Design a protein around this ligand. Structure first.
Ligand code: CLA
Ligand code: CLA
Ligand code: CLA
Ligand code: CLA
Ligand code: CLA
Ligand code: CLA
Ligand code: CLA
Ligand code: KC2
Ligand SMILES: CC1=C(C#C/C(C)=C/C=C/C(C)=C/C=C/C=C(C)/C=C/C=C(\C)C#CC2=C(C)C[C@@H](O)CC2(C)C)C(C)(C)C[C@H](O)C1
Ligand SMILES: CC1=C(C#C/C(C)=C/C=C/C(C)=C/C=C/C=C(C)/C=C/C=C(\C)C#CC2=C(C)C[C@@H](O)CC2(C)C)C(C)(C)C[C@H](O)C1
Ligand SMILES: CC1=CCCC(C)(C)[C@H]1/C=C/C(C)=C/C=C/C(C)=C/C=C/C=C(C)/C=C/C=C(C)/C=C/C1=C(C)CCCC1(C)C
Lengths: 189, 160, 173
């Protein structure tokens, strides 16, 4: 805001979102269309983390699935694997167990709505990372988790879409990089 | 409805647009059209003089509007719509925040990378320049395109 | 407690054996703990015999009754009469024990504790300290028996091998 004004850190032009405060981790203040105003921030935070935690595993997997396949499973481009496993019924097994865990999760969301638990804490810290000795680290880690999650969700999105246009696997695209098919060759007119 | 405070006010609103529409909107619009037209005019003139490295082969000689009809097939135009649209959604938030009471003045996105407006006085002179060049640019762009429609010729070519 | 995240269910209390506070769904809030406790022991007790039966029956068949390729098949190869005879014998045992107080409100109206049929023909409930520990062992083995039976049976219906047999040749789908 070249003219002086009170304003949000991430975007100079817009005012700091109301009810958006530094307290949730990773708050650069960017909620340009308030969603936080329409729905509670804690319910939204639970979503950012859940999507992210799902995404972070997915980014690793799409890359790992390209390089390696468990021997019992066939090696196919990952998007194809979902079709193979869905016929196999492997995906139903992932769906059933993930749903069971989610039902416990849905109860915890209801508690998050009624005070009680902080968004996204399932108290899953089997290892001692951020243990009471390491309790200082939790604030820092929280920031990393949102940041890794925000990035992963963008990255997976990218890997899958880029892969559809290129028809080229992400590791392969890196090492051999080509324009979307036909562009060097094609003339629009 | 027209008062001295807006920069560039010579008092010219014959059709009384100011009376029906918030000036803040009208101004944000005049600058936005102007900023786009200035770039458009520059581009149309640049395009005739130079082209990026592989461009001529894919598009050939099409220029001005014809290039757009050819460009859309490349998808160069789409990338431009998607990215420009993403900037615009923030721009819609900006107009909304400004229309809701807010600090931002119409047309201010906070882009001053070289700190050119740091002096308060110099900024005012620059603001008048920006509306005036922009008002000219829009007139020019329209002219170049109409000239194109009728002559089928790029503006530098028409001069040639 | 069992779910760290959720608050421990209120009606759950340390008194019942094997209360780890695991009622995320909170059915206990809605229904009496005793009625549920009776069902949990009763499903667990029926299952304990269930698992024992699946293992025994594949190995042993009455000369009197025909044998099925699977313990599950043995239920089918048995005459129709046998099932209905047993079904009635079992129902009566329910009647005698519950004193005809079968419905949830009726049962327990005259005390009866929870899930107690007063069956200790061999006297083992003589000492209280063992009886608690015995209650915890009973409920844990009953829940384990519920899960195992479901597994032994579903694998048998699917594969068709016997539970002991399935170990000898896994033959995964
Ligand atoms: C722990 C419980 C459990 C059990 C009993 C099963 C059972 C099964 N799963 Mg698995 N699964 C589970 C949890 C479980 N799932 C979880 C939590 C996930 C992640 C969400 C998955 C993800 C998954 C996928 C992605 C797939 C399956 C498939 C299958 C089926 C094929 C079995 C097989 O590969 O041949 C027999 C198994 C082997 C030869 C592998 C070796 C297993 C060793 C010998 C046993 C070790 C103990 C075992 C893991 C039990 C753990 C619990 C125990 C310690 C108490 C089978 C019905 C597949 C399917 O649908 O079939 C096509 C499939 O593609 N599952
Ligand atoms: C990081 C964000 C991002 C990403 C991933 C892309 C991705 C792409 N853009 Mg877009 N673009 C972006 C931002 C982005 N753009 C922005 C900010 C603008 C300005 C508003 C544009 C303006 C734009 C235009 C005008 C065009 C593209 C084109 C392309 C494509 C490149 C051609 C190809 O197939 O690859 C091959 C790429 C190369 C050989 C060069 C790679 C160079 C290094 C490695 C990167 C590709 C789909 C072109 C297109 O449509 O192609 C079909 C095209 O004409 N983009
Ligand atoms: C679209 C461009 C645009 C816009 C939004 C404005 C807006 C404004 N001008 Mg600027 N102006 C422009 C172009 C523009 N001007 C050009 C090209 C010139 C040079 C000729 C000027 C010269 C000028 C002077 C000298 C002054 C203004 C002033 C003003 C303000 C009050 C005038 C008013 O109420 O009318 C608003 C203007 C319009 C509504 C434009 C109407 C254009 C035609 C007639 C509309 C026809 C309908 C249209 C084709 C439908 C299609 C729309 C569709 C694409 C969505 C206002 C902020 C005054 C000021 O600063 O006050 C503070 C002032 O003194 N203007
Ligand atoms: C209204 C603005 C506008 C529009 C709609 C277009 C549209 C088009 N241009 Mg033009 N162009 C513009 C401005 C514009 N240009 C400007 C300002 C320049 C000068 C740098 C050029 C220079 C230019 C060349 C040399 C070529 C095109 C080409 C094209 C076509 C394909 C897009 C492309 O690759 O361009 C790429 C354009 C750019 C990378 C210029 C972007 C400059 C931005 C506006 C800077 C913004 C300031 C920034 C914040 C500071 C940094 C398409 C018809 C190509 C074509 O098909 O022609 C045969 C081509 O070869 N344009
Ligand atoms: C004539 C047959 C008969 C009768 C009258 C009963 C009567 C009863 N049984 Mg059942 N039971 C029977 C045969 C019978 N049983 C058989 C053959 C078995 C297999 C060994 C069981 C296994 C069994 C279990 C595992 C449980 C009962 C329970 C109960 C009591 C709860 C009443 C109720 O809600 O059930 C009415 C039934 C329903 C509302 C729906 C059940 C549907 C099934 C398939 C029938 C009641 C005294 C429950 C109990 O006492 O806990 C409180 C309990 O948990 N019974
Ligand atoms: C959930 C329990 C359950 C159910 C529904 C069945 C059902 C069946 N069994 Mg199996 N069986 C069971 C438990 C069970 N059994 C147990 C625990 C054993 C080990 C002793 C056996 C051993 C067994 C054999 C060896 C055979 C069967 C057979 C059969 C079928 C004919 C009925 C019969 O002859 O009963 C047989 C019943 C018994 C031998 C004992 C009754 C089971 C328990 C102990 C009754 C509980 C009553 C009471 C509440 C417990 C208090 C006493 C306690 C001290 C034990 C039928 C499908 C026959 C068949 O079809 O095979 C081809 C057959 O040959 N069963
Ligand atoms: C591992 C299994 C197990 C265990 C630890 C218990 C333990 C207990 N039962 Mg349960 N029960 C079981 C299986 C078991 N039962 C089965 C399968 C049935 C169905 C026939 C019953 C039916 C039953 C009734 C109807 C009643 C009990 C009662 C009791 C309590 C007093 C009896 C005693 O001294 O226990 C000793 C028990 C054992 C040593 C189990 C025998 C295991 C042998 C070694 C192998 C048998 C095969 C005690 C807490 C009474 C009660 O509520 O008391 C408060 C009562 O009324 N039980
Ligand atoms: C960032 C500056 C830049 C811009 C903004 C830009 C825009 C466009 C557009 C937009 C409308 C099209 C459609 C287009 C098309 C092609 N470009 Mg080009 N291009 C740029 C830079 C380079 C470089 C550095 C190279 C290059 C090439 C090619 C080839 C190759 C195959 C061919 O020649 O058939 C084709 C088809 C390579 C080459 O071989 O050039 C002779 C090469 O080295 N470009 N290019
Ligand atoms: C914040 C903010 C804003 C914003 C914003 C934005 C930009 C929001 C963008 C959000 C995005 C992009 C969220 C993306 C989530 C992606 C996920 C969860 C991926 C899941 C993948 C899975 C489950 C998978 C998989 C797979 C695997 C792993 C491998 C395969 O073999 C199989 C399979 C395909 C199944 C704006 C201004 C708009 C408004 C606002 O005022 C505030
Ligand atoms: C924000 C922030 C941080 C950050 C960050 C980062 C690093 C963000 C990076 C974001 C990026 C790179 C986003 C990229 C968007 C690209 C798009 C939408 C392309 C669309 C293509 C289209 C529409 C097309 C097309 C088409 C064309 C052209 C023609 C057709 O023939 C073909 C085709 C269909 C392909 C982090 C987490 C570090 C921390 C922090 O807490 C906050
Ligand atoms: C009449 C009839 C019909 C046809 C003929 C017939 C077959 C002879 C007869 C028999 C019918 C019969 C008797 C059919 C028998 C049917 C049965 C007993 C099915 C049991 C299903 C149990 C399941 C799915 C338990 C899953 C456990 C889980 C998810 C554990 C979760 C866990 C929890 C909660 C806590 C810790 C975390 C984990 C470890 C995750």
């Amino acid at each position: 805001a070249v003219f002086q004004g009170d304003f949000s850190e991430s975007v100079p032009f817009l005012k700091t979102p109301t009810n958006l405060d530094g307290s949730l981790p990773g708050d650069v203040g960017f909620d340009p269309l308030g969603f936080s105003e329409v729905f509670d921030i804690r319910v939204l935070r639970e979503a950012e983390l859940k999507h992210g935690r799902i995404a972070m595993l997915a980014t690793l997997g799409y890359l790992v699935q390209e390089a390696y396949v468990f021997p019992f499973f066939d090696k196919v481009p990952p998007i194809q694997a979902h079709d193979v496993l869905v016929k196999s019924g492997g995906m139903s097994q992932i769906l059933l167990w993930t749903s069971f865990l989610e039902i416990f999760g849905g109860i915890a969301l209801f508690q998050t709505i009624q005070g009680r638990r902080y968004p996204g804490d399932f108290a899953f810290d089997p290892l001692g990372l951020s243990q009471g000795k390491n309790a200082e680290k939790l604030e820092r880690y929280q920031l990393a988790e949102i940041k890794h999650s925000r990035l992963a969700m963008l990255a997976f999105s990218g890997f899958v879409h880029q892969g559809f246009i290129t028809k080229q696997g992400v590791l392969e695209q890196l090492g051999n990089f080509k324009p979307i098919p036909g562009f060097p060759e094609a003339t629009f007119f | 409805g027209l008062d001295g405070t807006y920069v560039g006010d010579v008092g010219f609103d014959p059709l009384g647009f100011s009376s029906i529409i918030d000036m803040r909107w009208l101004r944000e619009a005049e600058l936005k059209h102007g900023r786009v037209c200035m770039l458009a005019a520059t581009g149309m003139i640049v395009q005739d003089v130079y082209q990026f490295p592989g461009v001529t082969k894919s598009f050939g000689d099409a220029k001005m509007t014809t290039l757009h009809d050819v460009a859309v097939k490349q998808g160069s135009m789409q990338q431009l719509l998607v990215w420009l649209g993403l900037l615009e959604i923030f721009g819609f938030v900006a107009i909304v925040q400004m229309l809701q009471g807010s600090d931002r003045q119409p047309g201010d996105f906070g882009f001053d990378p070289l700190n050119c407006a740091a002096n308060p006085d110099t900024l005012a002179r620059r603001q008048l320049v920006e509306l005036k060049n922009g008002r000219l640019a829009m007139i020019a762009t329209a002219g170049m395109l109409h000239h194109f429609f009728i002559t089928g010729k790029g503006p530098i070519q028409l001069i040639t | 407690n069992a779910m760290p995240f959720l608050e421990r269910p209120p009606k759950l209390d340390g008194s019942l054996a094997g209360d780890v506070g695991f009622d995320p769904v909170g059915f206990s809030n809605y229904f009496d703990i005793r009625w549920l406790r009776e069902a949990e022991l009763k499903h667990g007790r029926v299952c304990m015999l269930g698992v024992t039966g699946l293992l025994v029956q594949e190995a042993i068949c009455l000369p009197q009754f025909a044998n099925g390729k699977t313990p599950v098949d043995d239920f089918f190869v048995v005459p129709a009469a046998g099932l209905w005879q047993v079904f009635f014998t079992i129902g009566a045992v329910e009647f005698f024990s519950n004193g005809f107080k079968l419905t949830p409100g009726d049962m327990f109206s005259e005390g009866r504790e929870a899930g107690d049929l007063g069956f200790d023909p061999l006297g083992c409930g003589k000492n209280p300290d063992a009886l608690a520990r015995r209650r915890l062992v009973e409920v844990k083995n009953g829940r384990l028996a519920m899960i195992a039976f479901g597994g032994m049976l579903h694998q048998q219906l699917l594969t068709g091998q016997g539970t002991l047999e399935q170990l000898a040749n896994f033959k995964a789908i």
